[PDB]
């Protein structure tokens, strides 16, 4: 019927896919902590980005058992990517780095999602 996932199983299976993103340098650097619009010059950020997401938040959600099923994790990774592509200019470091992370993530996540069902 509905498949139940234990938080420790999700963490064991999915954390390596997150670690693959963290390992990218310089590409993960903009994504390791939440965007701070006041520190940066950018008070329009949260006008445009309604649901912020970043690697530290996704990690915390895996660590604290906030995901019930693996597609919720995938959706947060993609939310992070889509926010960055929505806000940032195509020539920017953040935009290009986002694209690299999306390439890495795609390769990592597919066999893991097959394994989890
Ligand atoms: C997902 C992140 C995100 O979408 N934002 C929103 C855009 O703002 C940036 C963010 C991160 C980085 C950034 C780039 C890095 O490259 C190596 C490393 C990094 O390591 C923490 C952060 C750069 C910018 C940026 O556009 N800076 C401009 C703004 C206007 C003013 N001039 C001077 C700076 C945060």
UniProtKB/Swiss-Prot annotation:
Methylation of the KIX domain by CARM1 blocks association with CREB. This results in the blockade of CREB signaling, and in activation of apoptotic response. Residues 44-90 are annotated as: Interaction with histone. Residues 5-112 form the Bromo domain. It is found in: Cytoplasm; Nucleus. Found in a complex containing NCOA2; NCOA3; IKKA; IKKB and IKBKG. Probably part of a complex with HIF1A and EP300. Interacts with GATA1; the interaction results in acetylation and enhancement of transcriptional activity of GATA1. Interacts with MAF and ZCCHC12. Interacts with DAXX; the interaction is dependent on CBP sumoylation and results in suppression of the transcriptional activity via recruitment of HDAC2 to DAXX. Interacts with phosphorylated CREB1. Interacts with CITED4 (C-terminal region). Interacts (via the TAZ-type 1 domain) with HIF1A. (Microbial infection) Interacts with HTLV-1 Tax, p30II and HBZ. It is linked to Chromosomal aberrations involving CREBBP may be a cause of acute myeloid leukemias. Translocation t(8;16)(p11;p13) with KAT6A; translocation t(11;16)(q23;p13.3) with KMT2A/MLL1; translocation t(10;16)(q22;p13) with KAT6B. KAT6A-CREBBP may induce leukemia by inhibiting RUNX1-mediated transcription. This is CREB-binding protein. It comes from Homo sapiens. The lineage of its organism: Eukaryota, Metazoa, Chordata, Craniata, Vertebrata. The chain holds residues 1081 to 1197 of 2442 of the full protein.
